Amino acid sequence: LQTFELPTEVTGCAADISLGRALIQAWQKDGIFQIKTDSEQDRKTQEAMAASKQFCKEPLTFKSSCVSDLTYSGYVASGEEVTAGKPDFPEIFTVCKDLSVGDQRVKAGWPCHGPVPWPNNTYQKSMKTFMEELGLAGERLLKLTALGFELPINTFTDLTRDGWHHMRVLRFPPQTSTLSRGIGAHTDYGLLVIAAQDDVGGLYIRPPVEGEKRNRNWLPGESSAGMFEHDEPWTFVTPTPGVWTVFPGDILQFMTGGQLLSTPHKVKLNTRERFACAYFHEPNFEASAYPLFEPSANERIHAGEHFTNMFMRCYPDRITTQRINKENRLAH
Ligand SMILES: O=C(O)CCC(=O)C(=O)O
Ligand SMILES: [Mn+2]
């Protein structure tokens, strides 16, 4: 895979435009590239992964208490069945925008808005500072992408102001310990996905395949789930120190008219447990994404509406979903 070092500030100089061209080319050929982490980005990744490992060592009663009826942030034990001798399962802690009940959007009952049920304040601090760095990387990447497409440098800036960025903090069990098979082929609904992983290995991505029609996962009727899972090609994302991976999400596919494709990906379970984090760089919850290259187009996709429906469908029995239904929160 290509690995690039990003500049700290993207200003629009010739080097920035050149880098944007190269990022687009790498996505168009490989579906993914790596970005070099600096010493602080790396340190903060390691501290977040350590906090994740410590949290997963807590008893299940405690982990299961890290839930909220206002936000989807918090813990889920994935799956619905276990057996004797296969008692383990994937675990996710989702971090969405951390808004207290003092925030006006929370007071107004906006769906998905509320405070993260942090397990402790060291996990909180570790995840917040990691997500701050991930957000800055996302902004650099979007400015470079704009420059590479000959668009204004700040094309994405209003769209992502106070963006609804969120992250899944993941633990996958060893294959022999679980009835889970990992995560099947899917795409992520976001502008960009920035991901980190430990040394165990398990992530596979599907590059662009010339002539291969792709479902447009921003449309409810074109779910990408499961598609191509058993068909070649799948690229193994070899664990590599000192990098994050980056691929386009569904929103960038929409905005670019398919010049970038949302990268399908899947996770296979290994012989050891595996830790990873997947960060989703997003528009503002209230913003609508639009075609960048079709100025006459009136079609839009509303980020907040899609986020809410996706979480409601993925976690239909969570207290968060029950409260959305009880209070008819979709009406906001
Ligand atoms: O486990 C990984 O490396 C990626 C996980 C993922 O794709 C997700 O949480 O959407
Ligand atoms: Mn994913």
Side-chain angles (χ1 to χ4, degrees), residues 1-79 81-180 182-332:
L1 303 76
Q2 291 294 279
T3 302
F4 302 98
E5 186 168 353
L6 306 184
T8 299
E9 306 303 328
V10 181
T11 68
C13 67
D16 293 340
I17 299 169
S18 289
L19 176 55
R21 293 180 185 117
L23 298 190
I24 292 167
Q25 181 182 234
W27 278 331
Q28 290 180 330
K29 176 187 171 290
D30 298 326
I32 190 168
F33 53 76
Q34 292 170 160
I35 57 176
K36 190 187 191 307
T37 53
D38 80 19
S39 59
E40 284 293 276
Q41 294 172 323
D42 176 62
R43 181 182 62 80
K44 290 169 180 193
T45 302
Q46 300 308 321
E47 293 186 17
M49 296 279 277
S52 180
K53 295 171 178 186
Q54 289 306 115
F55 170 73
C56 289
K57 283 183 206 163
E58 298 280 11
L60 185 59
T61 41
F62 175 74
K63 297 185 290 194
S64 299
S65 77
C66 296
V67 294
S68 171
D69 69 1
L70 298 180
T71 176
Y72 286 93
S73 294
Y75 178 74
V76 67
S78 202
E81 300 193 329
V82 291
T83 193
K86 285 179 191 312
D88 208 348
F89 42 84
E91 300 178 271
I92 306 177
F93 193 102
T94 300
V95 182
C96 305
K97 191 178 296 292
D98 187 12
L99 300 178
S100 77
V101 300
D103 184 273
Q104 284 294 314
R105 297 164 281 196
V106 181
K107 293 181 181 175
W110 288 17
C112 308
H113 284 64
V116 175
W118 299 111
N120 60 62
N121 295 332
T122 62
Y123 192 107
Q124 176 178 200
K125 283 185 296 197
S126 290
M127 296 302 172
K128 284 190 173 186
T129 194
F130 182 35
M131 290 179 72
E132 287 174 357
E133 295 283 7
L134 290 159
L136 290 168
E139 287 301 302
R140 295 171 189 123
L141 288 159
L142 288 177
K143 288 179 179 178
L144 293 163
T145 297
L147 291 171
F149 280 124
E150 303 186 338
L151 294 167
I153 188 172
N154 277 294
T155 285
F156 298 96
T157 299
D158 286 348
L159 182 69
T160 62
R161 185 181 315 287
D162 192 36
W164 210 71
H165 314 311
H166 58 282
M167 179 167 69
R168 276 195 279 274
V169 182
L170 304 123
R171 175 188 168 266
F172 297 96
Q175 178 59 93
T176 54
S177 300
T178 185
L179 297 178
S180 173
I183 302 175
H186 69 285
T187 65
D188 294 336
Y189 186 87
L191 280 141
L192 297 169
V193 183
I194 306 174
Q197 63 180 335
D198 69 12
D199 59 352
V200 170
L203 177 65
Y204 295 75
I205 65 90
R206 185 178 193 80
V209 172
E210 314 278 76
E212 178 172 276
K213 184 176 179 283
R214 294 289 172 81
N215 269 6
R216 295 167 293 178
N217 191 57
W218 63 90
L219 300 172
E222 296 197 2
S223 175
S224 54
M227 300 284 292
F228 311 107
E229 187 154 329
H230 300 110
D231 303 306
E232 72 90 35
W234 290 88
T235 301
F236 180 59
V237 182
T238 302
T240 299
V243 304
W244 294 332
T245 58
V246 188
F247 53 83
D250 299 330
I251 305 177
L252 252 193
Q253 184 180 330
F254 170 74
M255 292 186 70
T256 66
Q259 295 188 41
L260 299 179
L261 296 174
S262 187
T263 300
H265 56 284
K266 65 189 185 173
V267 178
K268 297 183 198 284
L269 302 182
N270 212 326
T271 61
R272 294 177 293 170
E273 70 183 352
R274 170 172 178 272
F275 293 85
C277 296
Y279 168 86
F280 311 109
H281 203 72
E282 298 290 357
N284 190 285
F285 195 89
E286 298 178 77
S288 289
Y290 52 94
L292 292 164
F293 306 126
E294 223 163 316
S296 67
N298 54 358
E299 187 178 5
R300 302 289 184 269
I301 60 177
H302 187 273
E305 178 179 30
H306 203 275
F307 299 143
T308 302
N309 277 96
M310 285 191 315
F311 276 96
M312 288 178 78
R313 293 194 172 197
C314 192
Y315 310 109
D317 301 304
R318 201 176 185 85
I319 58 176
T320 325
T321 306
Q322 296 179 31
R323 182 162 184 172
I324 283 165
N325 288 330
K326 175 177 204 178
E327 293 176 341
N328 220 346
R329 292 191 162 212
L330 289 173
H332 299 291

